[PDB]
Amino acid sequence: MCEFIEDSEDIQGLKSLRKSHTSLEDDDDGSRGGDCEGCSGTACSSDAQCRARGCDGCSTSGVCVLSSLHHHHHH
C-alpha cells in the first residue's frame, strides 16, 4: 500500500501523515519518500532486487548495498 507515505511531500492534499507523526518517528524523514535508500539488511541473491530497492546492488555478501564488487560476484 502507498496512499499516505511516499506521498508525505504533499501535506497540502494529504494530511493523513498525522497518524504517521503520532509515533514521533516521522520527522526522522528516513521513512518518508525514500525508506529504501540504504538497505544493507536486505539479503539478495540477485542485484535486480536491490536495483528494485533503489538501493544499488547485491554485493559479494548477498546483501543489498552500494555493491563494491571485489572481482565480480559469485552470488
The residues that bridge with 11 in the sheet, in sequence order, are: none
Nearest CA to 20 out of 1, 54, 36, 28 is that of 28
Instruction: Specify the length of the chain in residues.
Output: 75
The amino acid occupying position 37 is: E
Give me the residue spans of the domains in the chain. 1-75
Beta carbons of 47 and 41 less than 8 angstroms apart: no
Q: Which residue has the cell 546492488?
A: 57
Please give the sequence-ordered ranges of beta strands (E in DSSP) within the chain, or none if there are none.
57-58, 64-65
Distance CA 21, CA 71 (A): 45
Beta carbons of 40 and 65 less than 8 angstroms apart: yes
Method: NMR
